[PDB]
Design a protein around this nucleic acid. Structure first.
Lengths: 341, 52, 122
RNA sequence: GCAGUCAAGCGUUCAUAGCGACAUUGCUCGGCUCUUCCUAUCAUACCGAAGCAGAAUUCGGUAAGCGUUGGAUUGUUCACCCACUAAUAGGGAACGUGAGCUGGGUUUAGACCGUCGUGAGACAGGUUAGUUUUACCCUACUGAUGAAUGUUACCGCAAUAGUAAUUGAACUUAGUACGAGAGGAACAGUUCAUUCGGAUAAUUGGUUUUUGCGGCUGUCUGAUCAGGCAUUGCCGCGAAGCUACCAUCCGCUGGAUUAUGGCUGAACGCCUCUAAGUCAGAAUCCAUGCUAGAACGCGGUGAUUUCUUUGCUCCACACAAUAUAGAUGGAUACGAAUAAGGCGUCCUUGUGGCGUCGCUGAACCAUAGCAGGCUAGCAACGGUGCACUUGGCGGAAAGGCCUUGGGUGCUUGCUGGCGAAUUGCAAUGUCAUUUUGCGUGGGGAUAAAUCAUUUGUAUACGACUUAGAUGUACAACGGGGUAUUGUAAGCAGUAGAGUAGCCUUGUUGUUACGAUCUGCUGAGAUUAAGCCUUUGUUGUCUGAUUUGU
RNA sequence: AGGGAAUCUGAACGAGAUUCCCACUGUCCCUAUCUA
RNA sequence: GUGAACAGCCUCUAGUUGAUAGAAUAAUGUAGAUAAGGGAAGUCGG
């Protein structure tokens, strides 16, 4: 096999942490560098191909895309790291004073038995003109060469029966560390949307813990699957919206439909919020939390520069076989049934 | 065939990266940060919904 | 005596990965504990201040079953019986506040020094 | 190789005691499969020489990063055929790979002894030996738990170890460069594919004890329907799941160099790519990226049990204990250079002038008091201890550094007066600093984890992810969707072969039996067990343990 | 009421042997899934 | 008894329910199936 992907062992957690970040330019505006959601879905798209030099210039191509569900990420903190001869070293983290039920749930393994007394003295530590919070924020701005944002996911807006959101750390590639820590100050308790991180025609690297297959039998026997994998260069085809109906509508199809198939995806619900439709196949299975970083570097070929003109979204039944896009088209083709009249 | 780490191809790709190839990414970044700045104002309006 | 036990979650309590549910042995021990508790009643002792201080199980003379067999061999099987014995004891809060005199010998230079110290210090 | 031709020298003087290098002249047991390594490299990368016009090629240099195919082959193959490919390079892992294995050879093959035998061999005489192989050993290698460092939880950092991409051609560039012509390139731009790896199941194909639905054969309930049943009786379709270059997606960019080409330039009054310097330059190296995280590497942050008969932490003095890889005046802070510097002063403010210093820390600062007591003063506004206190500074392990002041003892700067002894001529003579426990007298703070049940993104077992003390809670049912099968049971009919039966002998005459066709009927059944959704109904919400700076 | 055709061997043969022609198959390309 | 049948499959009379159990259900192994396209290219040798 590949000797790089060793030791071929089970990961530390389902939420794999992002190993490296995109560099930094100290003149660029403040913007997030990685996003997270919940991968669950896969679907077929057709599009006309404006890729000149190819055998399919001004032709149409069918291809497989994946739908990661991405509820609006909520900022609950910021971390500052000093540059040492020993690597980086977190000197101060700061939180949001009033955090959701989801994250106070993340701080316990057994949620129901506890008195739910998580950040009581920390919120009481805030309870004045600030004084100590602004002291720690001065501490971050004075030192700390890089600044990373503590976020979490909106787990309840996702159909998952987990209730327990994931903490993460996302660096900022907007220059002047002052603007980093003050962007964070403008964003405590607030939420960050998907399309404020990504857009169409943008290459990303989705990282995921790879679908556990359990025990398996130099070509050696042992563990197969459940490894933390980084896959790079998956083009974003569509960023979606929850409130907006006709997400499944293209420039061509234009029928008022959601990208959610009939009876939803298999083993996972519908979509009730923002999503990213990424091309190809992201690692992990359905219901799996994926962390989407962006490219690391200027990765422009013509596979990264071209504009996607989506023509049609397959929303037919994945559970079973596909014959109808809408429920409306099933009973339009069928005629009327027994229990109808 | 020239390798992935073939010196001449890395230099030819650096000739690319100082032209159109970075400028499109540096326009896309401005459009992303713009909508991020737009995301503050909406939430501030929903601050003023409760403040009303 | 724990080689090739199926490791359990219920051993976390004791810091051991391997643990078992040995029904026959448990039933015998609690039969002896019930006997010991009643011996405590007959003697006239407390019920809640009562802890097991000594519990010792050592090997007994083995039983000798035999079964015929490969090549018609006589592979001798042996039961491994045991002599269980235990003592339950009254718990004692604050045992003693008394010690030995601990007589200290010290030379002319130490006698002299201590005397000089009490001439100076309070 | 032999003989001769030269022939640097040496032969004890030395060519005529002899040896004698490079040349030169005479004729002439084999093979299947994997892992790792070597370079003495076949291809891929970059170069140098070559009548190298272009293309193609030959030799040579650096180079082991990555590659090195598919069939027919058996008079002893110790041969080779015919293609594909960029190319199908050569070897090691001393009996590598026969205790990972087979395909064809000894003749009833070891050793000793005997009998009959001219030169010549037999005898199915006779005695014999042919033990390392299994280890429910040992440990490598893969993977998995795990006590400990207050507990417990979340977010992290990254020492170290591994690492990966590969080759082919297609379009412009072109029918241009170059070419009598025949032919015929290359960089920059873009497009695919091959091998390899990491994944993933949208669709396609595959697959079925959902044995889901349907059909057939048999077999039992006395017949329909239901099925009992058939070593899963047989057949068609087939969800979920699992899956295939039989499917689809994805697989990077900066420095340092090698051969080589150079710049300035010595050695050597020319020159010289090298000696001091110096630019470029390979698929090379090291990083970036990609994977694990040290369970005795580290950081930040959240919570830390309240009547346990005030449990737990923090300040003060107090007694016991427990130790110390080893206090016993002070770890006393510029940086850089060495063919140079430090300091002081001055000015034209500089790679500046002038003076001075080192040649050891042999220094410098602290240092005299019952192991440092008690007191009388004199001189000066100093030095220092202690605790209150104004800030500023310190992130590389900051955990300390300076500073503003008020009080407060002490001062050996100088001079007085008391006290020390008997520790008997020495005996470390104990004065340091950790880790604690029991007592005190004041502050402060009001938990989680495990088991058990559930979950299924996980799963040998562990472990992991979940869920649950009155809620857009959870469980069971229930409804709605989506799928799979293909028209359920029952009933009716004018559709009815063919027949029994009233005689009006029928030109859908009739009463009944009557395969099947038709209708209610894309119906019926199943549909989460690892699909979706939940205003319905019904119920659950509390058991044991363990943990302290 | 599994083939077929030749040949070597003791004209059909005999589950004799070999070679070829036609059909068939997971033996393989290249494995994948299910049950016991 | 059904069946052309000593094939099985089902039973009457009569006799058994004896063989450690329970909990899980991943890979491997043995055995049996099915499979796109090609159809011995596998292998010394269908």
């Amino acid at each position: 096999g590949h000797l790089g992907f060793l030791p071929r062992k089970r990961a530390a957690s389902i939420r794999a942490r992002v190993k490296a970040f995109p560099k930094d330019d100290r003149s660029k505006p403040v913007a997030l560098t990685s996003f997270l959601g919940y991968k669950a879905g896969m679907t077929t798209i057709v599009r006309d191909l404006d890729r000149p030099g190819s055998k399919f210039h001004k032709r149409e191509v069918v291809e497989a895309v994946t739908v990661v569900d991405t509820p609006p990420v909520v900022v609950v903190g910021v971390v500052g790291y000093v540059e040492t001869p020993r690597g980086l070293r977190s000197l101060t983290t700061v939180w949001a004073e009033h955090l959701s039920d989801e994250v106070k749930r993340r701080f316990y393994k057994n949620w129901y038995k506890s008195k739910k007394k998580a950040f009581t003295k920390y919120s009481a530590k805030y309870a004045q003109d600030g004084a100590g919070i602004e002291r720690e924020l001065a501490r971050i701005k004075k030192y700390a060469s890089v600044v990373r944002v503590l976020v979490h996911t909106q787990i309840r807006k996702t159909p998952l029966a987990q209730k327990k959101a994931h903490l993460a750390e996302i660096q900022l590639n907007g220059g002047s560390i002052s603007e980093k820590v003050d962007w964070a100050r403008e964003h405590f308790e607030k939420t960050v949307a998907v399309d404020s991180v990504f857009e169409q025609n943008e290459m990303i690297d989705a990282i995921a813990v790879t679908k556990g297959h359990g025990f398996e039998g130099v070509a050696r026997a042992g563990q197969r699957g459940y490894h933390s994998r980084t896959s790079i260069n998956h083009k974003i085809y569509r960023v979606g919206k929850g409130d907006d109906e006709a997400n499944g509508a293209t420039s061509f199809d234009r029928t008022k439909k959601t990208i959610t198939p009939m009876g939803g995806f298999v083993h996972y619900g519908e979509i009730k919020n923002d999503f990213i439709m990424v091309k190809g196949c992201i690692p992990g299975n359905r219901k799996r939390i994926v962390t989407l970083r962006k490219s690391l570097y200027t990765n422009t070929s013509r596979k990264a520069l071209e504009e996607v003109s989506l023509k049609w979204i397959d929303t037919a039944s994945k559970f079973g076989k596909g014959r109808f896009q809408t429920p409306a088209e099933k009973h339009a083709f069928m005629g009327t049934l027994k229990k109808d009249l | 065939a020239k390798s992935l780490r073939a010196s001449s191809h890395l230099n030819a790709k650096s000739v690319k990266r100082r032209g159109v190839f970075q400028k499109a990414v540096d326009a896309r970044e401005q459009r992303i940060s713009d909508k991020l700045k737009e995301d503050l104002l909406k939430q501030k309006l929903e601050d003023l919904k409760k403040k009303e | 005596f724990n080689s090739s036990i199926g490791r359990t979650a219920q051993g976390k309590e004791f810091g051991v990965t391997k643990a078992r549910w040995p029904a026959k042995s448990v039933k015998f021990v609690q039969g002896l504990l019930q006997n010991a508790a009643a011996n405590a009643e007959a003697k006239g002792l407390d019920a809640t201040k009562l802890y097991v201080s000594h519990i010792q199980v050592n090997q007994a003379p083995k039983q000798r079953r035999r079964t015929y067999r490969a090549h018609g061999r006589i592979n001798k099987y042996e039961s491994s019986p045991s002599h269980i014995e235990l003592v339950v004891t009254e718990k004692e809060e604050a045992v003693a506040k008394a010690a030995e005199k601990k007589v200290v010998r010290l030379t002319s230079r130490q006698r002299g020094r201590i005397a000089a110290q009490k001439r100076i210090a309070a």
